mmCIF file with all atom_site columns, all heavy atoms in Angstrom:
data_model
loop_
_atom_site.group_PDB
_atom_site.id
_atom_site.type_symbol
_atom_site.label_atom_id
_atom_site.label_alt_id
_atom_site.label_comp_id
_atom_site.label_asym_id
_atom_site.label_entity_id
_atom_site.label_seq_id
_atom_site.pdbx_PDB_ins_code
_atom_site.Cartn_x
_atom_site.Cartn_y
_atom_site.Cartn_z
_atom_site.occupancy
_atom_site.B_iso_or_equiv
_atom_site.pdbx_formal_charge
_atom_site.auth_seq_id
_atom_site.auth_comp_id
_atom_site.auth_asym_id
_atom_site.auth_atom_id
_atom_site.pdbx_PDB_model_num
ATOM 1   N N   . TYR A 1 59  ? 58.696 30.449 -190.493 1.00 42.13 ? 59  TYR A N   1
ATOM 2   C CA  . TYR A 1 59  ? 58.209 29.584 -189.433 1.00 42.13 ? 59  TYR A CA  1
ATOM 3   C C   . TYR A 1 59  ? 57.813 30.502 -188.322 1.00 42.13 ? 59  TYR A C   1
ATOM 4   O O   . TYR A 1 59  ? 58.222 31.650 -188.326 1.00 42.13 ? 59  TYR A O   1
ATOM 5   C CB  . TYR A 1 59  ? 59.319 28.628 -188.954 1.00 42.13 ? 59  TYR A CB  1
ATOM 6   C CG  . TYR A 1 59  ? 60.589 29.317 -188.514 1.00 42.13 ? 59  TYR A CG  1
ATOM 7   C CD1 . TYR A 1 59  ? 60.794 29.631 -187.170 1.00 42.13 ? 59  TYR A CD1 1
ATOM 8   C CD2 . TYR A 1 59  ? 61.569 29.663 -189.428 1.00 42.13 ? 59  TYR A CD2 1
ATOM 9   C CE1 . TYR A 1 59  ? 61.961 30.257 -186.741 1.00 42.13 ? 59  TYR A CE1 1
ATOM 10  C CE2 . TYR A 1 59  ? 62.733 30.309 -189.005 1.00 42.13 ? 59  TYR A CE2 1
ATOM 11  C CZ  . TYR A 1 59  ? 62.915 30.591 -187.664 1.00 42.13 ? 59  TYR A CZ  1
ATOM 12  O OH  . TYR A 1 59  ? 64.071 31.217 -187.216 1.00 42.13 ? 59  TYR A OH  1
ATOM 13  N N   . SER A 1 80  ? 63.363 19.234 -190.693 1.00 31.52 ? 80  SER A N   1
ATOM 14  C CA  . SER A 1 80  ? 64.785 19.333 -190.400 1.00 31.52 ? 80  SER A CA  1
ATOM 15  C C   . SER A 1 80  ? 65.492 17.955 -190.395 1.00 31.52 ? 80  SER A C   1
ATOM 16  O O   . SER A 1 80  ? 65.180 17.068 -189.578 1.00 31.52 ? 80  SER A O   1
ATOM 17  C CB  . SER A 1 80  ? 64.929 20.026 -189.068 1.00 31.52 ? 80  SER A CB  1
ATOM 18  O OG  . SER A 1 80  ? 66.295 20.123 -188.747 1.00 31.52 ? 80  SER A OG  1
ATOM 19  N N   . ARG A 1 92  ? 75.165 20.183 -208.386 1.00 28.92 ? 92  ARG A N   1
ATOM 20  C CA  . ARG A 1 92  ? 74.438 19.181 -209.164 1.00 28.92 ? 92  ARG A CA  1
ATOM 21  C C   . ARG A 1 92  ? 73.308 19.764 -210.036 1.00 28.92 ? 92  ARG A C   1
ATOM 22  O O   . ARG A 1 92  ? 72.464 20.539 -209.563 1.00 28.92 ? 92  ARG A O   1
ATOM 23  C CB  . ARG A 1 92  ? 73.890 18.074 -208.254 1.00 28.92 ? 92  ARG A CB  1
ATOM 24  C CG  . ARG A 1 92  ? 73.310 16.871 -209.004 1.00 28.92 ? 92  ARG A CG  1
ATOM 25  C CD  . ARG A 1 92  ? 74.437 16.053 -209.663 1.00 28.92 ? 92  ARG A CD  1
ATOM 26  N NE  . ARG A 1 92  ? 74.210 15.822 -211.094 1.00 28.92 ? 92  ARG A NE  1
ATOM 27  C CZ  . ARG A 1 92  ? 74.868 16.428 -212.082 1.00 28.92 ? 92  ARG A CZ  1
ATOM 28  N NH1 . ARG A 1 92  ? 75.820 17.325 -211.818 1.00 28.92 ? 92  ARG A NH1 1
ATOM 29  N NH2 . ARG A 1 92  ? 74.577 16.128 -213.350 1.00 28.92 ? 92  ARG A NH2 1
ATOM 30  N N   . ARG A 1 96  ? 66.144 18.707 -206.751 1.00 22.64 ? 96  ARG A N   1
ATOM 31  C CA  . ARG A 1 96  ? 65.592 17.867 -205.723 1.00 22.64 ? 96  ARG A CA  1
ATOM 32  C C   . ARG A 1 96  ? 65.152 18.705 -204.548 1.00 22.64 ? 96  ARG A C   1
ATOM 33  O O   . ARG A 1 96  ? 65.699 19.786 -204.319 1.00 22.64 ? 96  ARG A O   1
ATOM 34  C CB  . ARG A 1 96  ? 66.509 16.707 -205.309 1.00 22.64 ? 96  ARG A CB  1
ATOM 35  C CG  . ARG A 1 96  ? 67.911 16.953 -204.788 1.00 22.64 ? 96  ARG A CG  1
ATOM 36  C CD  . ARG A 1 96  ? 68.577 15.588 -204.917 1.00 22.64 ? 96  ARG A CD  1
ATOM 37  N NE  . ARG A 1 96  ? 70.018 15.514 -204.682 1.00 22.64 ? 96  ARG A NE  1
ATOM 38  C CZ  . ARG A 1 96  ? 70.974 15.677 -205.614 1.00 22.64 ? 96  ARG A CZ  1
ATOM 39  N NH1 . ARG A 1 96  ? 70.662 15.969 -206.904 1.00 22.64 ? 96  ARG A NH1 1
ATOM 40  N NH2 . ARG A 1 96  ? 72.265 15.555 -205.236 1.00 22.64 ? 96  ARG A NH2 1
ATOM 41  N N   . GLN A 1 141 ? 57.824 28.623 -176.305 1.00 9.23  ? 141 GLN A N   1
ATOM 42  C CA  . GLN A 1 141 ? 58.536 28.966 -175.077 1.00 9.23  ? 141 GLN A CA  1
ATOM 43  C C   . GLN A 1 141 ? 58.987 30.412 -175.033 1.00 9.23  ? 141 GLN A C   1
ATOM 44  O O   . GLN A 1 141 ? 59.750 30.786 -174.139 1.00 9.23  ? 141 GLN A O   1
ATOM 45  C CB  . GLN A 1 141 ? 59.747 28.052 -174.920 1.00 9.23  ? 141 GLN A CB  1
ATOM 46  C CG  . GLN A 1 141 ? 59.381 26.658 -174.429 1.00 9.23  ? 141 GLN A CG  1
ATOM 47  C CD  . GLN A 1 141 ? 60.590 25.883 -174.015 1.00 9.23  ? 141 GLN A CD  1
ATOM 48  O OE1 . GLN A 1 141 ? 61.499 26.406 -173.351 1.00 9.23  ? 141 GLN A OE1 1
ATOM 49  N NE2 . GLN A 1 141 ? 60.612 24.621 -174.385 1.00 9.23  ? 141 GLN A NE2 1
ATOM 50  N N   . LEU A 1 151 ? 62.510 33.522 -193.804 1.00 7.05  ? 151 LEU A N   1
ATOM 51  C CA  . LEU A 1 151 ? 63.776 33.009 -194.355 1.00 7.05  ? 151 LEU A CA  1
ATOM 52  C C   . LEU A 1 151 ? 64.249 33.597 -195.738 1.00 7.05  ? 151 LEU A C   1
ATOM 53  O O   . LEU A 1 151 ? 65.369 33.297 -196.248 1.00 7.05  ? 151 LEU A O   1
ATOM 54  C CB  . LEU A 1 151 ? 63.704 31.481 -194.400 1.00 7.05  ? 151 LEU A CB  1
ATOM 55  C CG  . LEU A 1 151 ? 63.767 30.829 -193.003 1.00 7.05  ? 151 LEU A CG  1
ATOM 56  C CD1 . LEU A 1 151 ? 63.512 29.350 -193.111 1.00 7.05  ? 151 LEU A CD1 1
ATOM 57  C CD2 . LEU A 1 151 ? 65.093 31.103 -192.228 1.00 7.05  ? 151 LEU A CD2 1
ATOM 58  N N   . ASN A 1 171 ? 76.414 38.610 -190.116 1.00 3.83  ? 171 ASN A N   1
ATOM 59  C CA  . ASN A 1 171 ? 77.512 39.135 -190.887 1.00 3.83  ? 171 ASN A CA  1
ATOM 60  C C   . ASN A 1 171 ? 77.510 38.491 -192.277 1.00 3.83  ? 171 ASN A C   1
ATOM 61  O O   . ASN A 1 171 ? 77.465 37.263 -192.389 1.00 3.83  ? 171 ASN A O   1
ATOM 62  C CB  . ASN A 1 171 ? 78.827 38.800 -190.204 1.00 3.83  ? 171 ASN A CB  1
ATOM 63  C CG  . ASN A 1 171 ? 79.984 39.498 -190.882 1.00 3.83  ? 171 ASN A CG  1
ATOM 64  O OD1 . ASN A 1 171 ? 80.590 38.958 -191.826 1.00 3.83  ? 171 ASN A OD1 1
ATOM 65  N ND2 . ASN A 1 171 ? 80.219 40.751 -190.480 1.00 3.83  ? 171 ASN A ND2 1
ATOM 66  N N   . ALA A 1 178 ? 80.100 30.376 -194.291 1.00 2.00  ? 178 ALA A N   1
ATOM 67  C CA  . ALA A 1 178 ? 79.293 29.189 -193.936 1.00 2.00  ? 178 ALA A CA  1
ATOM 68  C C   . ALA A 1 178 ? 78.683 28.508 -195.169 1.00 2.00  ? 178 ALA A C   1
ATOM 69  O O   . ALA A 1 178 ? 78.738 27.299 -195.287 1.00 2.00  ? 178 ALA A O   1
ATOM 70  C CB  . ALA A 1 178 ? 78.244 29.527 -192.900 1.00 2.00  ? 178 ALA A CB  1
ATOM 71  N N   . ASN A 1 180 ? 79.744 28.844 -198.266 1.00 2.00  ? 180 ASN A N   1
ATOM 72  C CA  . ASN A 1 180 ? 80.751 28.659 -199.306 1.00 2.00  ? 180 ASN A CA  1
ATOM 73  C C   . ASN A 1 180 ? 80.355 29.290 -200.636 1.00 2.00  ? 180 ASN A C   1
ATOM 74  O O   . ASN A 1 180 ? 80.471 28.685 -201.717 1.00 2.00  ? 180 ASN A O   1
ATOM 75  C CB  . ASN A 1 180 ? 80.890 27.181 -199.546 1.00 2.00  ? 180 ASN A CB  1
ATOM 76  C CG  . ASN A 1 180 ? 82.278 26.761 -199.519 1.00 2.00  ? 180 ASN A CG  1
ATOM 77  O OD1 . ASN A 1 180 ? 82.828 26.364 -200.555 1.00 2.00  ? 180 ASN A OD1 1
ATOM 78  N ND2 . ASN A 1 180 ? 82.891 26.849 -198.338 1.00 2.00  ? 180 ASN A ND2 1
ATOM 79  N N   . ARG A 1 196 ? 59.247 43.304 -202.793 1.00 2.00  ? 196 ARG A N   1
ATOM 80  C CA  . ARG A 1 196 ? 57.993 42.625 -203.108 1.00 2.00  ? 196 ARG A CA  1
ATOM 81  C C   . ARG A 1 196 ? 57.112 42.199 -201.935 1.00 2.00  ? 196 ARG A C   1
ATOM 82  O O   . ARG A 1 196 ? 55.992 41.730 -202.173 1.00 2.00  ? 196 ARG A O   1
ATOM 83  C CB  . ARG A 1 196 ? 58.153 41.478 -204.104 1.00 2.00  ? 196 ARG A CB  1
ATOM 84  C CG  . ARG A 1 196 ? 59.319 41.607 -205.063 1.00 2.00  ? 196 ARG A CG  1
ATOM 85  C CD  . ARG A 1 196 ? 60.330 40.599 -204.618 1.00 2.00  ? 196 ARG A CD  1
ATOM 86  N NE  . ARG A 1 196 ? 60.317 39.478 -205.531 1.00 2.00  ? 196 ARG A NE  1
ATOM 87  C CZ  . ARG A 1 196 ? 60.988 38.347 -205.337 1.00 2.00  ? 196 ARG A CZ  1
ATOM 88  N NH1 . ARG A 1 196 ? 61.732 38.145 -204.227 1.00 2.00  ? 196 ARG A NH1 1
ATOM 89  N NH2 . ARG A 1 196 ? 60.895 37.423 -206.294 1.00 2.00  ? 196 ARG A NH2 1
ATOM 90  N N   . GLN B 1 316 ? 76.593 35.649 -183.434 1.00 15.50 ? 316 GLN B N   1
ATOM 91  C CA  . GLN B 1 316 ? 75.408 36.464 -183.666 1.00 15.50 ? 316 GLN B CA  1
ATOM 92  C C   . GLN B 1 316 ? 74.084 35.720 -183.463 1.00 15.50 ? 316 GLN B C   1
ATOM 93  O O   . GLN B 1 316 ? 73.837 34.699 -184.118 1.00 15.50 ? 316 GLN B O   1
ATOM 94  C CB  . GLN B 1 316 ? 75.436 37.016 -185.074 1.00 15.50 ? 316 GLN B CB  1
ATOM 95  C CG  . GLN B 1 316 ? 76.565 37.987 -185.344 1.00 15.50 ? 316 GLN B CG  1
ATOM 96  C CD  . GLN B 1 316 ? 76.613 38.295 -186.802 1.00 15.50 ? 316 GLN B CD  1
ATOM 97  O OE1 . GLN B 1 316 ? 76.704 37.386 -187.639 1.00 15.50 ? 316 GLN B OE1 1
ATOM 98  N NE2 . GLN B 1 316 ? 76.494 39.575 -187.135 1.00 15.50 ? 316 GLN B NE2 1
ATOM 99  N N   . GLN B 1 340 ? 64.532 30.466 -178.203 1.00 8.56  ? 340 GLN B N   1
ATOM 100 C CA  . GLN B 1 340 ? 63.879 29.600 -179.159 1.00 8.56  ? 340 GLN B CA  1
ATOM 101 C C   . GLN B 1 340 ? 63.616 30.340 -180.474 1.00 8.56  ? 340 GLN B C   1
ATOM 102 O O   . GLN B 1 340 ? 63.160 31.470 -180.432 1.00 8.56  ? 340 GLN B O   1
ATOM 103 C CB  . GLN B 1 340 ? 62.578 29.091 -178.538 1.00 8.56  ? 340 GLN B CB  1
ATOM 104 C CG  . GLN B 1 340 ? 61.816 28.098 -179.434 1.00 8.56  ? 340 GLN B CG  1
ATOM 105 C CD  . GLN B 1 340 ? 60.392 27.878 -178.958 1.00 8.56  ? 340 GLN B CD  1
ATOM 106 O OE1 . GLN B 1 340 ? 59.968 28.483 -177.969 1.00 8.56  ? 340 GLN B OE1 1
ATOM 107 N NE2 . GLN B 1 340 ? 59.655 27.000 -179.639 1.00 8.56  ? 340 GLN B NE2 1
ATOM 108 N N   . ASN B 1 341 ? 63.922 29.707 -181.612 1.00 7.88  ? 341 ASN B N   1
ATOM 109 C CA  . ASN B 1 341 ? 63.531 30.147 -182.955 1.00 7.88  ? 341 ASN B CA  1
ATOM 110 C C   . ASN B 1 341 ? 64.366 31.281 -183.570 1.00 7.88  ? 341 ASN B C   1
ATOM 111 O O   . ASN B 1 341 ? 64.311 31.513 -184.789 1.00 7.88  ? 341 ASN B O   1
ATOM 112 C CB  . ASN B 1 341 ? 62.046 30.503 -183.018 1.00 7.88  ? 341 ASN B CB  1
ATOM 113 C CG  . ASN B 1 341 ? 61.132 29.289 -183.118 1.00 7.88  ? 341 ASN B CG  1
ATOM 114 O OD1 . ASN B 1 341 ? 59.929 29.442 -183.317 1.00 7.88  ? 341 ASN B OD1 1
ATOM 115 N ND2 . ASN B 1 341 ? 61.680 28.097 -183.015 1.00 7.88  ? 341 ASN B ND2 1
ATOM 116 N N   . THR B 1 360 ? 65.943 23.663 -173.163 1.00 2.00  ? 360 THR B N   1
ATOM 117 C CA  . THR B 1 360 ? 64.793 23.569 -172.276 1.00 2.00  ? 360 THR B CA  1
ATOM 118 C C   . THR B 1 360 ? 63.608 22.788 -172.876 1.00 2.00  ? 360 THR B C   1
ATOM 119 O O   . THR B 1 360 ? 62.480 23.202 -172.735 1.00 2.00  ? 360 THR B O   1
ATOM 120 C CB  . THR B 1 360 ? 64.263 24.940 -171.924 1.00 2.00  ? 360 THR B CB  1
ATOM 121 O OG1 . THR B 1 360 ? 63.946 25.617 -173.137 1.00 2.00  ? 360 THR B OG1 1
ATOM 122 C CG2 . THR B 1 360 ? 65.274 25.729 -171.132 1.00 2.00  ? 360 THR B CG2 1
ATOM 123 N N   . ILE B 1 366 ? 67.432 21.431 -183.989 1.00 2.00  ? 366 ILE B N   1
ATOM 124 C CA  . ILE B 1 366 ? 67.704 22.683 -184.663 1.00 2.00  ? 366 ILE B CA  1
ATOM 125 C C   . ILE B 1 366 ? 67.381 22.430 -186.110 1.00 2.00  ? 366 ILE B C   1
ATOM 126 O O   . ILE B 1 366 ? 67.257 21.270 -186.533 1.00 2.00  ? 366 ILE B O   1
ATOM 127 C CB  . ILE B 1 366 ? 69.210 23.034 -184.601 1.00 2.00  ? 366 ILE B CB  1
ATOM 128 C CG1 . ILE B 1 366 ? 70.022 22.033 -185.417 1.00 2.00  ? 366 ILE B CG1 1
ATOM 129 C CG2 . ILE B 1 366 ? 69.713 23.153 -183.156 1.00 2.00  ? 366 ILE B CG2 1
ATOM 130 C CD1 . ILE B 1 366 ? 71.475 22.466 -185.626 1.00 2.00  ? 366 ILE B CD1 1
ATOM 131 N N   . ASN B 1 386 ? 63.273 32.283 -207.506 1.00 2.00  ? 386 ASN B N   1
ATOM 132 C CA  . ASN B 1 386 ? 62.247 33.255 -207.197 1.00 2.00  ? 386 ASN B CA  1
ATOM 133 C C   . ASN B 1 386 ? 62.321 33.950 -205.861 1.00 2.00  ? 386 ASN B C   1
ATOM 134 O O   . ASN B 1 386 ? 61.979 35.112 -205.782 1.00 2.00  ? 386 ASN B O   1
ATOM 135 C CB  . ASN B 1 386 ? 60.867 32.627 -207.396 1.00 2.00  ? 386 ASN B CB  1
ATOM 136 C CG  . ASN B 1 386 ? 60.605 32.321 -208.848 1.00 2.00  ? 386 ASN B CG  1
ATOM 137 O OD1 . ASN B 1 386 ? 60.223 33.204 -209.612 1.00 2.00  ? 386 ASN B OD1 1
ATOM 138 N ND2 . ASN B 1 386 ? 60.855 31.077 -209.259 1.00 2.00  ? 386 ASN B ND2 1
ATOM 139 N N   . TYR B 1 388 ? 64.921 34.600 -203.777 1.00 2.00  ? 388 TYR B N   1
ATOM 140 C CA  . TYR B 1 388 ? 66.152 35.352 -203.478 1.00 2.00  ? 388 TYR B CA  1
ATOM 141 C C   . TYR B 1 388 ? 66.607 36.176 -204.702 1.00 2.00  ? 388 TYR B C   1
ATOM 142 O O   . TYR B 1 388 ? 67.585 36.911 -204.608 1.00 2.00  ? 388 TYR B O   1
ATOM 143 C CB  . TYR B 1 388 ? 67.282 34.390 -203.018 1.00 2.00  ? 388 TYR B CB  1
ATOM 144 C CG  . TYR B 1 388 ? 66.989 33.690 -201.709 1.00 2.00  ? 388 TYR B CG  1
ATOM 145 C CD1 . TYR B 1 388 ? 66.854 32.305 -201.653 1.00 2.00  ? 388 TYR B CD1 1
ATOM 146 C CD2 . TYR B 1 388 ? 66.809 34.415 -200.547 1.00 2.00  ? 388 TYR B CD2 1
ATOM 147 C CE1 . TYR B 1 388 ? 66.559 31.665 -200.469 1.00 2.00  ? 388 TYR B CE1 1
ATOM 148 C CE2 . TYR B 1 388 ? 66.512 33.789 -199.365 1.00 2.00  ? 388 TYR B CE2 1
ATOM 149 C CZ  . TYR B 1 388 ? 66.383 32.401 -199.318 1.00 2.00  ? 388 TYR B CZ  1
ATOM 150 O OH  . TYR B 1 388 ? 66.089 31.768 -198.111 1.00 2.00  ? 388 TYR B OH  1
ATOM 151 N N   . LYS B 1 399 ? 72.535 25.474 -202.465 1.00 2.00  ? 399 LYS B N   1
ATOM 152 C CA  . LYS B 1 399 ? 72.233 24.161 -201.968 1.00 2.00  ? 399 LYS B CA  1
ATOM 153 C C   . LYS B 1 399 ? 73.524 23.374 -201.696 1.00 2.00  ? 399 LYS B C   1
ATOM 154 O O   . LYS B 1 399 ? 73.704 22.797 -200.626 1.00 2.00  ? 399 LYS B O   1
ATOM 155 C CB  . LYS B 1 399 ? 71.340 23.422 -202.936 1.00 2.00  ? 399 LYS B CB  1
ATOM 156 C CG  . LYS B 1 399 ? 69.941 23.897 -202.930 1.00 2.00  ? 399 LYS B CG  1
ATOM 157 C CD  . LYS B 1 399 ? 69.162 22.997 -203.861 1.00 2.00  ? 399 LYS B CD  1
ATOM 158 C CE  . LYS B 1 399 ? 67.734 23.111 -203.552 1.00 2.00  ? 399 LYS B CE  1
ATOM 159 N NZ  . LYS B 1 399 ? 66.961 22.145 -204.350 1.00 2.00  ? 399 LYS B NZ  1
ATOM 160 N N   . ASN B 1 401 ? 77.207 24.050 -202.196 1.00 2.00  ? 401 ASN B N   1
ATOM 161 C CA  . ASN B 1 401 ? 78.622 24.396 -202.066 1.00 2.00  ? 401 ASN B CA  1
ATOM 162 C C   . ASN B 1 401 ? 79.222 24.091 -200.709 1.00 2.00  ? 401 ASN B C   1
ATOM 163 O O   . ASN B 1 401 ? 80.450 24.101 -200.548 1.00 2.00  ? 401 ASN B O   1
ATOM 164 C CB  . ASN B 1 401 ? 78.854 25.887 -202.292 1.00 2.00  ? 401 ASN B CB  1
ATOM 165 C CG  . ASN B 1 401 ? 79.139 26.248 -203.741 1.00 2.00  ? 401 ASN B CG  1
ATOM 166 O OD1 . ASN B 1 401 ? 78.958 25.461 -204.699 1.00 2.00  ? 401 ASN B OD1 1
ATOM 167 N ND2 . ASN B 1 401 ? 79.580 27.487 -203.902 1.00 2.00  ? 401 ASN B ND2 1
#
Side-chain angles (χ1 to χ4, degrees):
Chain A
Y59 55 94
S80 179
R92 189 71 233 107
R96 58 197 171 271
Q141 283 192 43
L151 289 173
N171 188 271
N180 230 248
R196 333 108 105 188
Chain B
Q316 295 171 305
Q340 183 194 1
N341 281 188
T360 57
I366 67 169
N386 293 278
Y388 295 117
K399 286 184 161 186
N401 270 13

